[model samples]
Target: ESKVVVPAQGKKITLQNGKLNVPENPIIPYIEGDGIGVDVTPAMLKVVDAAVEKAYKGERKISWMEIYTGEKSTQVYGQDVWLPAETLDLIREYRVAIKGPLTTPVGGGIRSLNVALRQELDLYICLRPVRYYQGTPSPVKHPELTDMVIFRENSEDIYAGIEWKADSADAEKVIKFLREEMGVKKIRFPEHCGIGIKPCSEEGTKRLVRAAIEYAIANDRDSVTLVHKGNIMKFTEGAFKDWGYQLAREEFGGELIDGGPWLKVKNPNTGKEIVIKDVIADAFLQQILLRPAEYDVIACMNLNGDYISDALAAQVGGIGIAPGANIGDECALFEATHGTAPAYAGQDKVNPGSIILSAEMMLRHMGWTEAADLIVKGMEGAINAKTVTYDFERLMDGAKLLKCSEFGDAIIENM
Candidate 1:
């Protein structure tokens, strides 16, 4: 029942046996995004198309469908309509989609449309796999050592967007109620303070941790680490850690190690022992830069995962190439982790690696491992040949820099 037209040329992807049933010509919807989206989106699409064709030798193909959202939606659906209802329906109808960087208007307007889509779709896990590609520019001496996947609790926590403005009547009322009804005196300046609630429930924490542990087991990862600031925010963050460990023991058959916080569990798939551990947020940050190889899969609350994802991306290089996905039981949305560079919009100058890699993730999600592997090989070949976009070109030595579109061509040529 999608309002958007589905081309007769391609078929829809159906779910079968808890996995995607991608046909030879499955129709996939895409939102071109806001700023540099114009530049990178097409580049990514072209690279993916090339890889798919090369991998299957014209036996399989993806029919790219344009779905309206963001500025484009406003143009087609009218001003002030950032996300159209039809777009959401189409995304749900399609089940799997990818997008480039979106612009969240500053200081005012709608909050984050990216967050809006996730909340609407009930996509509760933000998955980010941070790994180093050989020959890519990096700030770290051992970027190759930093390979970790992050599972961010996509719902609940402070990201639930529950807040009252400073000095507002709602803030004043809540503060007064806390003081009078609850016998609380924590607020130093109740008269002028803003209020925000952090609601971290056992359900939210356990689901996110479950996904992380499941991923670790499936991928044969060494360990899954629960990162939190339990020392300070005991109820919210501390409960997250406690509930995560409890869930591991109850559902995943995790057992105590050395009578302490660390737990060990056997991977059901590989029969390898996967350690489940917890680390204080501050110490975990330092350890990631110091000894990242020790950690494999990371599960954390929304805010912590947000910061950790960006920090880990920086260790390998910039967020310019960080690929991410927001997933649920039924639907998946792969997206570029970087922002819309308005200054460089439509210039065809910035890097397209973020969306291209995101497309790679999407292909793998569709069980198109051959196409995904080709993307990885093409990226490796391009970087090894020093045919990179401006982001890596500026940092790398003896590099033959290509324009954004040209880099897409380079990847396709290598593929």
Candidate 2:
């Protein structure tokens, strides 16, 4: 049997809980994303490097190594399959990577390499941090209201990746199991559409929620709201809420508040303690708009995160400067939440803020607080000054559309 070779990573990235320390120079991995990734990723690296240089001087530095994945990887590696074992192995060892967008074709291929990476590595926590960069053109009146950090359960819910065709043999087996054994009636499917399955397990649900709660406690956040469409998929999503509460009380007994949206109660079955409570998923959406202050960190499943992230981005303005991360306890991967936008790939008309901000997260993870803060301050200062890309130029009505590399230069200049 092959042994799981886990490298001993002692050069710790210090969170210091100060929100300022750049952990260690984390062995960060960089993946030039598919499509327009070639255009923006370099710009991102430049800005990140400048920030580190300005903030830390010669005291610290990131030991960055390039890892190939996606279409570019296939072209170089001579295979259509984007994810190579070497890339995965590097991430396993380093435990921190930043990537650009990946194009996932719908038809049969190697499936979505993005999804495969998440599943294979068990990166169960997907964090999306969305906010408005002031002076950036946004349709919303108060773009500032959009500041929120979302934690989507990466490895559970419908995204646990169960599926079948409507009339396939596997579908028949599922139908038989539901009707005869589990007794789930009213099964519906498109005439010839492929069917998807959701297998949300108790163990899976608990782990994702635990990460969210831990994040909340660690960051000194106000609340960690549980979002789910439990009324429909009661046992699945509803039980997820239950499992979340279990962690809050059992694990986070002194960490979180009690009698709030997440209630602290003792489990009567075994007289064990648990956190018991819930909020409807749809209602939670409204809360995001009406009471964003009420939510600090959020815990939801895969689809919920995908939908909510986009919605929240729109509420703040759009995804131009949004950043996201696929994380687990030991390793976390940062990424831009926006698409490749092939038409604007090399045009230099698009914003590189998303990738730059993701680099900030990477820096923060490494305990490079001084460097991360410099990037944040420089980027936000530039945005406030109305020096932005075309997207913001159109919205800000006279804002200059800085070229991609130019924008990075601007940020460096400011830093």
Candidate 3:
């Protein structure tokens, strides 16, 4: 709505020096993705803008601009495949951006715009804060009780995008090598089902763990847990756990240890500190269900994150109340982890809390804690007051249902 300002229109928006001079409006460059994007994005943006304005008043405002990608981008940039050079440049320049649910290209056309952005920007940490709204439709009765913030390694693991179909020559070569050289003759698959690679790098693992520990220490949380399927994938996921522990010892040994027994066992090589014992991946899953309160933060790989986030969200409720983010130390991009419901596009029927809550994270990152607090408090207030979207209204009797836009307005109203 802020004129969809772009870097291509260099006038008033340029990155000449190392520094960036964006407009006073905060010029949040973005890609309003396909399908439900048009409906949910504006609603989320308005809520974020309102929160920033009300909390900061004449002090600061988010100047949103349109940085194109996805279907809209292909039309504009002469390529529909993936992210454009200009879009990447804008993200690097601004050092901050937000987006709606960008459609995943079908027919194996290209890598997801979302995935491309995360990889390009090196936003390696995916944070999913899953919690239940009081009245959201939930499979579990205690949706509010399931609160866990997951830190999933964004750039590595199975999401590394490695693959080959069974019938492909490349696949045949690899399969033969596995059978003859590696003595893995038992391996078999459907005739044409494609395969994907699970390449979780140590560099990727350490960075993600770094974020988790940092978050724990900053928030005064008790501990940071490393979750992985190390027993099965020793080289990748296992190595991830090892490197994660190595980082904990290197960086925040004292806090993670917190006078715990693990502190007594100094690193034999570096004589540094380490945290608590590692939980087996399956055990961790059970622990989350059996003792959800014991865990504060979980740092894991891609596929695990995908599974864990949704699983935890289900425990609390559906995806509507969950908010997620792709973050680096300085630059952060927040988004709704849910899909682009084409059915709901332009209908203004879906929920915007996920993206809006993600905006709250952005505000906090900008040192606007007051505004962030206002937004969360207002959201909780809204939920408590039973002023919610239809998804939530269906669960609680005698509840007033608010549309997507009105929900944002309600948060603003409460603020």
Candidate 4:
């Protein structure tokens, strides 16, 4: 039923009764992706393999199984099928996978291959942990203080691909129904207006906030801030914060601090107090610049999360070195948080840090902290050495420029 070729030397990782059971040598599915994926993926593989080897002394190994998707899938299967069911099957079977950047076609084959994958897998948690490295070019004076992890609700809202075309028959039908059946006279220019629904379920908000609070507890974080446009979008965005707080209080034994609003919960593991807070989306954006350290873990709805994650990434640097993951209850996909820089395709000129760091996160997710720690240390050392790719070298004084692979090698050398 599938075209995947399993690795003979490795065993499949499994989740039984909600616990991950990873073997010493686990088969991990991966999509090489498109464009700079060709360059960065190989670099990521090299850096990760080296770190694992050094960390485990050959005791632990990853049997990487390459599965095709995107333009590469078209080449393997037929042009009509962009994402093969076989690819999804393999990732689901393996449970944890990593990928380089995938290309999004302009004129449309699939609207967004990334979004399609997330929706298919029900990967409702979009994890983006933003931290700064020394010698990296940052717009902020104190980028180190801006460290935070984001939990983006991935399943719904306007970004969930639930909209009708502006001039389509379906749009007019929905508009007519809204005006006549629902008594929605507030719609301006209702003639051929497009319609989109933002669905924020109590189930979705609770699970998302639970994951953020769990992450905060495990990581010894100071707080979990629920950022939303609650003032305007009361039912959808506003209820997100309301449900988030309700979950914190009911599930995590959170109590209101100082009489109102903010709540504090004791981390059961560490016995440390973790603040549960909320802020308007716009003001939250400004607060990051004014008092970045006050925020720790962030949980938000779809569209708000997309903008906030990108904005936070820019505060440290750009998405060139950012890493992200779309995680579900049983399956997870860690990926380079940037696009396939098609212009730099096959040139090996772009920074491989994004995929490399994503792989670092992949390692940590698999309970390989020794390898992950080495990777972070290696990256910190590589950046502080003033040797980086064109992205950082151009802004940094007296910095040495290396190709994508070379920068990855620099990380290993420093490790």
Give the number of the best model, judged by lDDT: 4
Q: What would the per-residue lDDT of candidate 3 be over residues 198-252, giving only the tens digit for each residue?
A: 7867788878887787676566555567788888889988898888878776765
Model 2 accuracy (lDDT, Cα) = 0.73
CA deviation > 4 Å runs, candidate 3: 1-4, 7-25, 75-82, 135-137, 182-195, 254-277
Error of 4 at 38 (Å): 0.5
- For candidate 1, write residues 1-415 as lDDT tens digits: 3346677799988886778788899999999999999999989999999999999999999998888778777777776878888767777777899998887666554788998888888889999999988888888899899889999999888988898888889998988899999998887888888899999998888889999998988889999999999999999999999998998899999988997889888998888989999999999999999999999899999999999999999989857999999988778889998998989998999899999999999999998999999998888798779889989999978999899999998888887
For TM-score, candidate 1 versus 4, the one ahead is 4
Report model 1's TM-score to 2 decimal places. 0.97
lDDT of 4 at 20: 84
Residue-pair clashes per prediction, in order, are 0, 12, 4, 0
RMSD in angstroms between candidate 4 and the native structure over all alpha carbons: 1.1
All candidates' TM-scores? 0.97, 0.87, 0.86, 0.98
| lDDT tens digits, residue span 1-415, model 2 | 2122232442533332433233445556788897668778989988887887778785566666678777777677765657788777767667778998887766554576777778777888888877777666665566676666788888766776678876788877777777679876676643454566777888787888777766665565556677888888888887887777777777756334454555643333444333334578898878778876656667888898888888888777667778888887556778877887887777766778888888898887766678888998888788877787777777666676788888887788777
TM-score of candidate 4 against the unseen true structure:
0.98
Model 1 segments more than 4 A misplaced: 1-3
CA shift of 233, model 2, Å = 1.0
Candidate 4: the clashing residue pairs are none
Tally clashing residue pairs in candidate 2: 12
Q: lDDT of all the models against the reference? A: 0.89, 0.73, 0.73, 0.90
